[PDB]
Amino acid sequence: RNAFYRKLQNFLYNVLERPRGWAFIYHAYVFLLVFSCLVLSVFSTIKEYEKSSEGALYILEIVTIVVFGVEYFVRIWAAGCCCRYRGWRGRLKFARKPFCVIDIMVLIASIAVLASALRSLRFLQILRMIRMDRRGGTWKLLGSVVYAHSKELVTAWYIGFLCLILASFLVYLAEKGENDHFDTYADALWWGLITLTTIGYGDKYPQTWNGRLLAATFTLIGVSFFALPAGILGSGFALKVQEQHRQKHFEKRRNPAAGLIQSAWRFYATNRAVCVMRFLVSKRKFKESLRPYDVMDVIEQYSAGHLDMLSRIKSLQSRVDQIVGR
Amino acid sequence: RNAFYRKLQNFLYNVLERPRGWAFIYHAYVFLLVFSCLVLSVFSTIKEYEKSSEGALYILEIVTIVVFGVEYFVRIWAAGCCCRYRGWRGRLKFARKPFCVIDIMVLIASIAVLASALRSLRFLQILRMIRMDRRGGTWKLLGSVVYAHSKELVTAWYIGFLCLILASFLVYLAEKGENDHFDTYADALWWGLITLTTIGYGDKYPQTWNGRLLAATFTLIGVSFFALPAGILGSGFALKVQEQHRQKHFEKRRNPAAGLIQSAWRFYATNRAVCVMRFLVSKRKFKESLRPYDVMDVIEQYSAGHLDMLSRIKSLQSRVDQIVGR
Amino acid sequence: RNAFYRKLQNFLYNVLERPRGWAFIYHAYVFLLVFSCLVLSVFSTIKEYEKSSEGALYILEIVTIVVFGVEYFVRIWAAGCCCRYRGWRGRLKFARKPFCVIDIMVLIASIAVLASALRSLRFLQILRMIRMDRRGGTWKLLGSVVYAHSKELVTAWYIGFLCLILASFLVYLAEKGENDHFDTYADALWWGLITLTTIGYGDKYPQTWNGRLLAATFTLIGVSFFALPAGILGSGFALKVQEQHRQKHFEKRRNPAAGLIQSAWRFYATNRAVCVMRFLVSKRKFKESLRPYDVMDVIEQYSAGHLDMLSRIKSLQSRVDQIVGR
Amino acid sequence: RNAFYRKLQNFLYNVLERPRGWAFIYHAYVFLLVFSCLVLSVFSTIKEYEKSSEGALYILEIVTIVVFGVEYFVRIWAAGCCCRYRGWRGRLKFARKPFCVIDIMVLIASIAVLASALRSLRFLQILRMIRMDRRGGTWKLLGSVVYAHSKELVTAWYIGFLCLILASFLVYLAEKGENDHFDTYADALWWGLITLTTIGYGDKYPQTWNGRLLAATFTLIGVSFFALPAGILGSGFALKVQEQHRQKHFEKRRNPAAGLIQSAWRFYATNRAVCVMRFLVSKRKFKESLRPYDVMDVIEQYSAGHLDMLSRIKSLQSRVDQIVGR
Amino acid sequence: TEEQIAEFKEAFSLFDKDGDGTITTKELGTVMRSLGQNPTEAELQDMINEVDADGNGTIDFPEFLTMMARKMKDTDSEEEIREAFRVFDKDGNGYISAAELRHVMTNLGEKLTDEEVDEMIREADIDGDGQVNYEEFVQMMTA
Amino acid sequence: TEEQIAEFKEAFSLFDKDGDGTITTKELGTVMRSLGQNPTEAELQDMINEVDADGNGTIDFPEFLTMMARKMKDTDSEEEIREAFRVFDKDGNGYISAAELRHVMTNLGEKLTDEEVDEMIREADIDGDGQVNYEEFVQMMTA
Amino acid sequence: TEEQIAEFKEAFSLFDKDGDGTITTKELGTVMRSLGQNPTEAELQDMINEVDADGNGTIDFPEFLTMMARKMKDTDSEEEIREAFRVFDKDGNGYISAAELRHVMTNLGEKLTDEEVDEMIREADIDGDGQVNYEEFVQMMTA
Amino acid sequence: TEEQIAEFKEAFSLFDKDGDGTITTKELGTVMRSLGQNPTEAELQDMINEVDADGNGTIDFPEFLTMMARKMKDTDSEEEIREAFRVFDKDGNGYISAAELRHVMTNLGEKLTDEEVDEMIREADIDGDGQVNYEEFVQMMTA
Ligand SMILES: C=C(C)[C@@H]1CCC(C)=C[C@H]1c1c(O)cc(CCCCC)cc1O
Ligand SMILES: C=C(C)[C@@H]1CCC(C)=C[C@H]1c1c(O)cc(CCCCC)cc1O
Ligand SMILES: C=C(C)[C@@H]1CCC(C)=C[C@H]1c1c(O)cc(CCCCC)cc1O
Ligand SMILES: C=C(C)[C@@H]1CCC(C)=C[C@H]1c1c(O)cc(CCCCC)cc1O
Ligand SMILES: C=C(C)[C@@H]1CCC(C)=C[C@H]1c1c(O)cc(CCCCC)cc1O
Ligand SMILES: C=C(C)[C@@H]1CCC(C)=C[C@H]1c1c(O)cc(CCCCC)cc1O
Ligand SMILES: C=C(C)[C@@H]1CCC(C)=C[C@H]1c1c(O)cc(CCCCC)cc1O
């Protein structure tokens, strides 16, 4: 059953590691489980329901222990599919992966906690919550979209901060005496931040009509400047998704790769100028196909087609001229 | 008048079922009607206006019964236009449609209620409000746009939740003693959720300056992370609408369909390899026209044009070479 | 000086009617003026500053009357530039324009008011504020963008309304007894609307922990559904602006127009089948240039180029075949 | 070491003036420094921490003095890289730059303040904060995006203002008597502005059920109209960034420039019709490459290719016709 | 009238060379080539699409009479020519300058002989102001 | 059956001119050209991939028998034909008018002879209402 | 001057082969082909619109003299050449390296003979630092 | 070594037919055509760009020796080979099936003779599992 064993091992590795479809459902389950623990912790804080919260939390934590331990061991076993993790040394290197190290250490620390330990339990719960990512994908995506719009976010922050400072100062001037809310410029700054973000507690609000007019005038644009980052990032995310959907179809990374591997094999077997030159050529084509993944490839295709057709027309001209001479 | 009868029946079916233009106006009317009922129910809750609210609601409910009954019977009668619903069995199957079943059962339940029944009346009103969709179109559209951006929404939720947890914890630490609002970490979590969403009741707000500084620092990014989903989904919806408008014009689904039907007829009449293989080919063209509905078709068109042109140029080269040899 | 007189008249007509550049500055001035009046009216309401507000408002109103009267007469005079408004009958028809009628009638009503008249003054001020549009451009733009996204706005409203109703009902159930805020389902509906819009007065908020948990769970998605329309419309507006900028350059409406005018003149002079057929053809080209104004024209251009090149290649094939036969 | 000296001078000029990569890190540092000073000023306002805040602020201000002075002198020295600023007169002109003048004058004013001077210190701190831009880049970007969408923002403002006025008036009518919040129409206007922006202090809110219904009906659309500008500008910023990313690759500004410089040199050496006309032609090509930077260039490329191919086909037709005659 | 129908029949016979009452595109192309200009395949396909009222690629004589019955006023073609003129009215004042008018007539779209544009300046310029109008001009063509 | 396999072998030998059991694109092109129509490189290659179940560019006799084994009902080709007819059902009522049907057959897609469309009107029009149905029709082709 | 006008008239007669004062595109093409380089229809048409100040496709002698009245300083072409040089100034320091300069001259845009780039290096190297400037250089060309 | 430099000089002389030490693209094209297949203009220009380290369109002998000095391990081309194999690794398990491997070698990119792919299946398949690995394989090519 070695074939069936290998099939099962590959399926387990795929579901535990990067999944594609219904495999994600499993993760959801475990995620909910760990999420549940987190929620129960919060409930343990309320003294009204602390007893029942802790009673459920103990068994939920032990269940988390069992699930995470079995998942970790299954992941270690299923790491054999990839070549880089084979045998004692290979699987030891696999356990050397940062997230596998995090998983094993959190498992052991939680086990020890089972054997004021509550704070450690809460910290471990949040630690597993953050480890749920397992790849940094969310952070990578957010950082990419933010850095792409770094100039826009910076200008939004700069102008919004200037608006906040100026509006807070003017309202403070208009409300310094006739209102205890704006006793100090720090209070006015707190008010300005709370309003321009549109949180608006109501603990501080202008009461003098001059202050009200100034606050109206400034918030009317400050709220927009403060809401700008949300819109900028949302539009950036949507455009990134749309372009990913469009680029999902082209699949123009195939021929350069085959050429690259063939040329590398030929040059390796050579051991000459043509072989090495062609290897460099094929690597060049490989990476030049890697980069664009966009409409620049299409413009390159138009340029190639047009220049080729022009060359064929020049050949036509030569042929017709020579025929006329004949 | 069978021709006029059939024309009227088709018009009724079109207006009752999927309409296109001014037919929608009728739906608006009925929608308003049912909506009005819902509103009156709410007004019946206010003890100040309960008597008049119920007095109007009785007649409005009877009117709703009349309208829905006549509409249901007219829909059943007009279902004859489509072939699938003809005769006793055909119309029985039409009534087997899930939304027709819902309509008939809600009608029957409401009339029975007419003959603490108020709660059943409210539930039936909301039931007809939800049934007003009649197709799941809104749910389908929302699900499509959400699933398209599933990664973006998930990262937004993950980072926003981490920001919520961290900000609530830090503000709780900075306000645990000197403020009764943040008595328990659950209270701090409630505060964090209310502010980061920018609802900001003001029932809980930081009062210690350390708490105020921490809340400012964290909300300044938390509000953006919490507003992200709205912007992401709005941009996704707008882009989907724009691409639908663009794709509304191409109309490149005609020739493959004609080829498919013609080849299917030919293969049916065959009863051979050529006809069956051409039927498969025409089906292939049909589906391959079905899929793209986007610029990928245009890139395919460029590829086809370029390869055909190159073939013609090769033919030219052969001809000119042979003429030179001639 | 009739030439200079006509130049000045055309300049006045352009600045008063649809302007392009710095002409708009003039409008801003007058707009500010009328806007100022509106503001003063509000200030007249505050009894603390009623006397000074009214004292300034009388002068500002007389100034508004002077400015609007002189502007109206200058507009009537400058209407002579267009052919449709020439002479007694032409200028009478020009005054028949709906906004000119509104302007003259508001001017007359205001002067009469000058000779509880305050309410009429406020209504006239808001009337001139709305008339400031003079074309319906803002309403036309908003309606266009809304109707383009009608399906998306409708689904957003439907799902957000369902979320509002359900969340309000559940919070009402969880807070009916232990909180006087949610005394009646109408109060819960008011709370739900105020929170899901993120206005969050704080006059009503959940206080029972079950109510708080339910409110958190529901608002976390309700706020997004309620903020959706803003994002959808913002993205639609931005995309419309971007496509307008792109389409501003093509200017492919020239040759069809020249052909249309030439063919119309030829057919008029004919008084035959060729002339009328060409007139219809040129009108067809005119409208077909009118419609696309988008990338569909570009795809049509690709199709035309490809089919023409195919025809030339077929001629090539015929020529080479005949040469081979020769 | 003059070569190394010049390399260091150019590196210093690049990092101080427009940087590209890790040079920005330095700016961040100095920015934080100045920002820190600003924050300390706010802390000096709180009487609870005024003493420590001032004690740290004096040191931080002296540190800012040192850093800005050394940076200014290093910038003046490194200005030698550019040709326009060489020698006494060149560097004097460099100091004539508006931001260099601002820097030197703020440095001197701060030095003098070191030797109620607190207000001057705060104003100087905000002055250096604003001078941190050093180029107007943020203002330029915001103005560009705003002016591009001027029509959209104006319609949003107009419709939102009409909604604000109407909703405030109707709620005032429905709440004039039975609520002291809406004592005067100015109070109702303040309420309307605070809610439609979704700031929602809660200091004023409708309490009569007619007022609550009217407020619900109007805010349901007013909040969207007020949030529109944020979404419009966010989408505009995202689209601008996307188009900048796309246009970053084409790099089609090279050949026209080389032609322009070569033709200018030829025309200068001429001292004739051909050279001057070619100089004008090359300038024309230079600016015509400058303008599009968009897909209009691509449509021009398609037009050029198609017309060229058609010309080649006409030559083909002439050749084949003459061969047939031969 | 009887003579009107007779001349329409003569025109159709000259057009429909086949004589079966089913006029084809090639006949129109050939007769037009006789008239002087070469029509394109797309031009003729649009022509047949416009004239045809049945959808079989040929026009019967009654259809030809019906399309001939449409006069300048009857066709209600006013909006199209007005909007075309506004497209040319680069100033938008309701009048078009003689220089630009002649340049467009003789250099844009279908280049038009100097005789036709001379006739335009002759007839349309009732006022002779150079800023020749097009609304009254198109109105008198409609009449 | 034995005769069925014999006739399939005869057809394959006619197709696979080489006789080695590896039918190629050129053989399909030549045989179809014999049948009357010229096939394109894209057409023939797509034919080959659709028929092929191994991925070497040639089809063995067992694969040929397997593809012949699929009948109209077995292939479950219903959805495609129904949706194509709906695409043609410009009214969407479930019936297609005779005029539009004949126009599409004789003027769209693959040009179909008047005989085939005549056979369609003959067989599909069980009720003879002119508004021929495409559901019972496809049901009878499936059966 | 009188001799200036005489030589300009000689140049125009050489250009305007017709001699009617209406220089056409074909005349420029032919005379400059005699000068050596092959033009394009777009090239010569752009030439004509750039030189034309009337809008009829032909240039009269007064227009030719007027366009020749624009000297290097008068044309105010400073900004264009400065921005082009900045475009080449990949470092942006205000000086362009000699190697890159020669490479661009002899390998980019219009292929310029080694003699012209040699003249550039000769005249522009007032300081002879290799990192030739393009501001003082363009300044002396302006002067 | 001395013999290594001698054989490099022989190869360069066979390549640089001119013998002036400035190898041109045409010489590469001619010698390669001698080797059997035709190079394209873009192919050769990319080749010269990759090999050239000066920027004049010709390669001197020291540059040729320098580019020959780069070994498979020295070039550090590992990442490219691994990512290409992953691109082919449709399953991504670290191993590539023999059938897909041979199909890709003999049917994709540069058509590769059956001998080369046979050599791959021979040398690379140390374990002979059919699911041949590409990581250890590229390691041994690197070594
Ligand atoms: C630079 C921003 C953000 C724009 C443009 C400049 C001005 C005039 C307003 C901003 C703005 C609002 O801040 C709010 C609205 C909504 C209606 C406001 C009711 C008076 C529109 C609106 O354009
Ligand atoms: C670290 C973040 C995310 C932001 C952005 C970067 C900077 C330098 C500070 C944070 C920040 C505050 O933490 C506080 C304020 C205003 C003070 C509020 C009044 C008590 C502004 C302010 O941008
Ligand atoms: C990761 C997000 C969401 C961005 C980028 C990181 C930082 C510096 C801030 C966020 C942000 C705000 O959260 C708010 C504003 C508006 C003005 C704030 C006034 C200090 C701008 C602004 O870029
Ligand atoms: C089911 C929805 C829609 C959301 C998203 C998915 C998850 C697992 C829970 C919901 C949710 C809460 O229901 C509550 C909180 C915070 C607790 C609030 C403090 C009382 C976060 C939180 O994401
Ligand atoms: C259907 C909507 C609107 C999405 C998708 C479904 C779910 C899981 C949440 C919505 C949503 C939020 O409503 C809010 C956030 C911000 C962080 C929330 C903190 C727990 C993200 C976030 O995806
Ligand atoms: C006319 C507008 C613009 C909206 C949208 C269309 C519909 C039918 C009603 C309006 C509206 C309310 O006027 C009130 C509610 C909830 C009641 C609030 C609780 C007192 C929802 C609600 O959609
Ligand atoms: C002109 C705008 C802004 C649209 C279109 C007209 C109407 C019906 C509503 C607006 C709108 C909301 O203002 C709010 C929602 C969210 C749910 C509201 C709950 C009743 C949807 C929603 O389309």
JSON list of N, CA and C in Angstrom, two decimals, chain C residues 81 84 253-255 257-258 262 265-266 272-273 277 280-281 283-284 286, chain E residues 46-47 50 68 77 83 86-88 90 93 105 108 110 112 116 120 123 141:
[
{"chain": "C", "resi": 81, "resn": "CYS", "atom": "N", "xyz": [-26.67, 86.38, -29.36]},
{"chain": "C", "resi": 81, "resn": "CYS", "atom": "CA", "xyz": [-25.64, 85.66, -30.10]},
{"chain": "C", "resi": 81, "resn": "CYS", "atom": "C", "xyz": [-26.21, 84.45, -30.80]},
{"chain": "C", "resi": 84, "resn": "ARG", "atom": "N", "xyz": [-31.44, 81.21, -32.38]},
{"chain": "C", "resi": 84, "resn": "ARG", "atom": "CA", "xyz": [-32.79, 80.91, -31.92]},
{"chain": "C", "resi": 84, "resn": "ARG", "atom": "C", "xyz": [-33.41, 82.06, -31.14]},
{"chain": "C", "resi": 253, "resn": "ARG", "atom": "N", "xyz": [-15.14, 62.03, -34.29]},
{"chain": "C", "resi": 253, "resn": "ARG", "atom": "CA", "xyz": [-16.48, 62.45, -34.67]},
{"chain": "C", "resi": 253, "resn": "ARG", "atom": "C", "xyz": [-16.47, 63.47, -35.81]},
{"chain": "C", "resi": 254, "resn": "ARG", "atom": "N", "xyz": [-15.37, 63.58, -36.55]},
{"chain": "C", "resi": 254, "resn": "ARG", "atom": "CA", "xyz": [-15.21, 64.64, -37.54]},
{"chain": "C", "resi": 254, "resn": "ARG", "atom": "C", "xyz": [-15.65, 64.19, -38.93]},
{"chain": "C", "resi": 255, "resn": "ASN", "atom": "N", "xyz": [-15.00, 63.17, -39.47]},
{"chain": "C", "resi": 255, "resn": "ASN", "atom": "CA", "xyz": [-15.31, 62.74, -40.84]},
{"chain": "C", "resi": 255, "resn": "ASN", "atom": "C", "xyz": [-16.75, 62.31, -41.00]},
{"chain": "C", "resi": 257, "resn": "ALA", "atom": "N", "xyz": [-19.36, 63.46, -39.56]},
{"chain": "C", "resi": 257, "resn": "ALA", "atom": "CA", "xyz": [-20.16, 64.68, -39.62]},
{"chain": "C", "resi": 257, "resn": "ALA", "atom": "C", "xyz": [-20.03, 65.37, -40.97]},
{"chain": "C", "resi": 258, "resn": "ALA", "atom": "N", "xyz": [-18.80, 65.47, -41.49]},
{"chain": "C", "resi": 258, "resn": "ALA", "atom": "CA", "xyz": [-18.60, 66.11, -42.78]},
{"chain": "C", "resi": 258, "resn": "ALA", "atom": "C", "xyz": [-19.32, 65.34, -43.88]},
{"chain": "C", "resi": 262, "resn": "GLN", "atom": "N", "xyz": [-22.39, 66.85, -46.16]},
{"chain": "C", "resi": 262, "resn": "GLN", "atom": "CA", "xyz": [-22.21, 66.85, -47.61]},
{"chain": "C", "resi": 262, "resn": "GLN", "atom": "C", "xyz": [-23.31, 66.05, -48.30]},
{"chain": "C", "resi": 265, "resn": "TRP", "atom": "N", "xyz": [-26.64, 67.89, -48.19]},
{"chain": "C", "resi": 265, "resn": "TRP", "atom": "CA", "xyz": [-26.67, 68.94, -49.20]},
{"chain": "C", "resi": 265, "resn": "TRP", "atom": "C", "xyz": [-26.87, 68.36, -50.59]},
{"chain": "C", "resi": 266, "resn": "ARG", "atom": "N", "xyz": [-26.16, 67.27, -50.91]},
{"chain": "C", "resi": 266, "resn": "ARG", "atom": "CA", "xyz": [-26.29, 66.67, -52.23]},
{"chain": "C", "resi": 266, "resn": "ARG", "atom": "C", "xyz": [-27.71, 66.18, -52.47]},
{"chain": "C", "resi": 272, "resn": "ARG", "atom": "N", "xyz": [-31.16, 59.76, -58.49]},
{"chain": "C", "resi": 272, "resn": "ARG", "atom": "CA", "xyz": [-31.72, 60.20, -57.23]},
{"chain": "C", "resi": 272, "resn": "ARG", "atom": "C", "xyz": [-31.58, 59.12, -56.16]},
{"chain": "C", "resi": 273, "resn": "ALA", "atom": "N", "xyz": [-31.66, 57.86, -56.58]},
{"chain": "C", "resi": 273, "resn": "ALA", "atom": "CA", "xyz": [-31.53, 56.76, -55.63]},
{"chain": "C", "resi": 273, "resn": "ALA", "atom": "C", "xyz": [-30.17, 56.78, -54.95]},
{"chain": "C", "resi": 277, "resn": "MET", "atom": "N", "xyz": [-29.65, 57.18, -50.92]},
{"chain": "C", "resi": 277, "resn": "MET", "atom": "CA", "xyz": [-28.98, 56.07, -50.25]},
{"chain": "C", "resi": 277, "resn": "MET", "atom": "C", "xyz": [-27.71, 56.54, -49.56]},
{"chain": "C", "resi": 280, "resn": "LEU", "atom": "N", "xyz": [-28.64, 58.41, -46.36]},
{"chain": "C", "resi": 280, "resn": "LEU", "atom": "CA", "xyz": [-28.91, 57.47, -45.28]},
{"chain": "C", "resi": 280, "resn": "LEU", "atom": "C", "xyz": [-27.63, 56.83, -44.76]},
{"chain": "C", "resi": 281, "resn": "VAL", "atom": "N", "xyz": [-26.72, 56.48, -45.67]},
{"chain": "C", "resi": 281, "resn": "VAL", "atom": "CA", "xyz": [-25.45, 55.87, -45.27]},
{"chain": "C", "resi": 281, "resn": "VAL", "atom": "C", "xyz": [-24.65, 56.82, -44.40]},
{"chain": "C", "resi": 283, "resn": "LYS", "atom": "N", "xyz": [-25.73, 59.37, -42.61]},
{"chain": "C", "resi": 283, "resn": "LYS", "atom": "CA", "xyz": [-26.38, 59.48, -41.31]},
{"chain": "C", "resi": 283, "resn": "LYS", "atom": "C", "xyz": [-26.06, 58.26, -40.44]},
{"chain": "C", "resi": 284, "resn": "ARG", "atom": "N", "xyz": [-26.06, 57.07, -41.05]},
{"chain": "C", "resi": 284, "resn": "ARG", "atom": "CA", "xyz": [-25.72, 55.86, -40.31]},
{"chain": "C", "resi": 284, "resn": "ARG", "atom": "C", "xyz": [-24.31, 55.95, -39.74]},
{"chain": "C", "resi": 286, "resn": "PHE", "atom": "N", "xyz": [-22.69, 58.67, -39.11]},
{"chain": "C", "resi": 286, "resn": "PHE", "atom": "CA", "xyz": [-22.73, 59.70, -38.08]},
{"chain": "C", "resi": 286, "resn": "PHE", "atom": "C", "xyz": [-23.16, 59.11, -36.74]},
{"chain": "E", "resi": 46, "resn": "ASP", "atom": "N", "xyz": [-23.81, 48.20, -45.73]},
{"chain": "E", "resi": 46, "resn": "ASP", "atom": "CA", "xyz": [-24.58, 49.16, -44.95]},
{"chain": "E", "resi": 46, "resn": "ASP", "atom": "C", "xyz": [-25.72, 49.75, -45.78]},
{"chain": "E", "resi": 47, "resn": "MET", "atom": "N", "xyz": [-25.46, 50.01, -47.06]},
{"chain": "E", "resi": 47, "resn": "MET", "atom": "CA", "xyz": [-26.52, 50.52, -47.94]},
{"chain": "E", "resi": 47, "resn": "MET", "atom": "C", "xyz": [-27.69, 49.55, -48.00]},
{"chain": "E", "resi": 50, "resn": "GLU", "atom": "N", "xyz": [-29.64, 49.42, -44.79]},
{"chain": "E", "resi": 50, "resn": "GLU", "atom": "CA", "xyz": [-30.50, 50.58, -44.58]},
{"chain": "E", "resi": 50, "resn": "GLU", "atom": "C", "xyz": [-31.74, 50.53, -45.46]},
{"chain": "E", "resi": 68, "resn": "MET", "atom": "N", "xyz": [-38.23, 56.07, -51.67]},
{"chain": "E", "resi": 68, "resn": "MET", "atom": "CA", "xyz": [-38.20, 57.31, -52.44]},
{"chain": "E", "resi": 68, "resn": "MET", "atom": "C", "xyz": [-39.22, 58.31, -51.94]},
{"chain": "E", "resi": 77, "resn": "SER", "atom": "N", "xyz": [-34.85, 64.51, -40.48]},
{"chain": "E", "resi": 77, "resn": "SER", "atom": "CA", "xyz": [-33.41, 64.42, -40.29]},
{"chain": "E", "resi": 77, "resn": "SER", "atom": "C", "xyz": [-32.82, 65.69, -39.68]},
{"chain": "E", "resi": 83, "resn": "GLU", "atom": "N", "xyz": [-26.82, 68.77, -35.09]},
{"chain": "E", "resi": 83, "resn": "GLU", "atom": "CA", "xyz": [-25.74, 68.38, -34.19]},
{"chain": "E", "resi": 83, "resn": "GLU", "atom": "C", "xyz": [-24.42, 68.28, -34.94]},
{"chain": "E", "resi": 86, "resn": "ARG", "atom": "N", "xyz": [-23.21, 71.88, -35.10]},
{"chain": "E", "resi": 86, "resn": "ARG", "atom": "CA", "xyz": [-22.64, 72.26, -33.82]},
{"chain": "E", "resi": 86, "resn": "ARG", "atom": "C", "xyz": [-21.28, 71.62, -33.61]},
{"chain": "E", "resi": 87, "resn": "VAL", "atom": "N", "xyz": [-21.11, 70.37, -34.05]},
{"chain": "E", "resi": 87, "resn": "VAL", "atom": "CA", "xyz": [-19.80, 69.73, -33.98]},
{"chain": "E", "resi": 87, "resn": "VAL", "atom": "C", "xyz": [-18.78, 70.55, -34.76]},
{"chain": "E", "resi": 88, "resn": "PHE", "atom": "N", "xyz": [-19.18, 71.05, -35.93]},
{"chain": "E", "resi": 88, "resn": "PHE", "atom": "CA", "xyz": [-18.30, 71.95, -36.68]},
{"chain": "E", "resi": 88, "resn": "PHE", "atom": "C", "xyz": [-18.25, 73.35, -36.09]},
{"chain": "E", "resi": 90, "resn": "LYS", "atom": "N", "xyz": [-17.07, 75.34, -34.01]},
{"chain": "E", "resi": 90, "resn": "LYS", "atom": "CA", "xyz": [-16.03, 75.34, -32.99]},
{"chain": "E", "resi": 90, "resn": "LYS", "atom": "C", "xyz": [-16.23, 76.46, -31.99]},
{"chain": "E", "resi": 93, "resn": "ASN", "atom": "N", "xyz": [-21.47, 79.62, -31.48]},
{"chain": "E", "resi": 93, "resn": "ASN", "atom": "CA", "xyz": [-22.34, 80.79, -31.44]},
{"chain": "E", "resi": 93, "resn": "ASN", "atom": "C", "xyz": [-23.56, 80.66, -32.33]},
{"chain": "E", "resi": 105, "resn": "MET", "atom": "N", "xyz": [-15.33, 71.73, -46.00]},
{"chain": "E", "resi": 105, "resn": "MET", "atom": "CA", "xyz": [-16.03, 71.15, -47.15]},
{"chain": "E", "resi": 105, "resn": "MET", "atom": "C", "xyz": [-15.05, 70.57, -48.16]},
{"chain": "E", "resi": 108, "resn": "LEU", "atom": "N", "xyz": [-12.17, 67.86, -45.71]},
{"chain": "E", "resi": 108, "resn": "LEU", "atom": "CA", "xyz": [-12.52, 66.90, -44.67]},
{"chain": "E", "resi": 108, "resn": "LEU", "atom": "C", "xyz": [-13.61, 65.95, -45.15]},
{"chain": "E", "resi": 110, "resn": "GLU", "atom": "N", "xyz": [-15.65, 63.49, -47.03]},
{"chain": "E", "resi": 110, "resn": "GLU", "atom": "CA", "xyz": [-15.60, 63.32, -48.48]},
{"chain": "E", "resi": 110, "resn": "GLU", "atom": "C", "xyz": [-15.25, 64.67, -49.09]},
{"chain": "E", "resi": 112, "resn": "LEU", "atom": "N", "xyz": [-15.10, 67.68, -51.22]},
{"chain": "E", "resi": 112, "resn": "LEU", "atom": "CA", "xyz": [-16.20, 68.15, -52.03]},
{"chain": "E", "resi": 112, "resn": "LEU", "atom": "C", "xyz": [-15.71, 69.22, -53.00]},
{"chain": "E", "resi": 116, "resn": "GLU", "atom": "N", "xyz": [-19.70, 72.85, -55.23]},
{"chain": "E", "resi": 116, "resn": "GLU", "atom": "CA", "xyz": [-20.71, 72.62, -54.21]},
{"chain": "E", "resi": 116, "resn": "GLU", "atom": "C", "xyz": [-20.59, 73.62, -53.06]},
{"chain": "E", "resi": 120, "resn": "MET", "atom": "N", "xyz": [-23.08, 76.47, -51.60]},
{"chain": "E", "resi": 120, "resn": "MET", "atom": "CA", "xyz": [-23.41, 76.70, -50.20]},
{"chain": "E", "resi": 120, "resn": "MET", "atom": "C", "xyz": [-23.26, 78.16, -49.82]},
{"chain": "E", "resi": 123, "resn": "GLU", "atom": "N", "xyz": [-26.15, 80.23, -51.48]},
{"chain": "E", "resi": 123, "resn": "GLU", "atom": "CA", "xyz": [-27.53, 80.08, -51.03]},
{"chain": "E", "resi": 123, "resn": "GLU", "atom": "C", "xyz": [-27.69, 80.30, -49.53]},
{"chain": "E", "resi": 141, "resn": "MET", "atom": "N", "xyz": [-33.67, 74.25, -46.03]},
{"chain": "E", "resi": 141, "resn": "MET", "atom": "CA", "xyz": [-33.60, 72.95, -46.68]},
{"chain": "E", "resi": 141, "resn": "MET", "atom": "C", "xyz": [-34.75, 72.05, -46.25]}
]
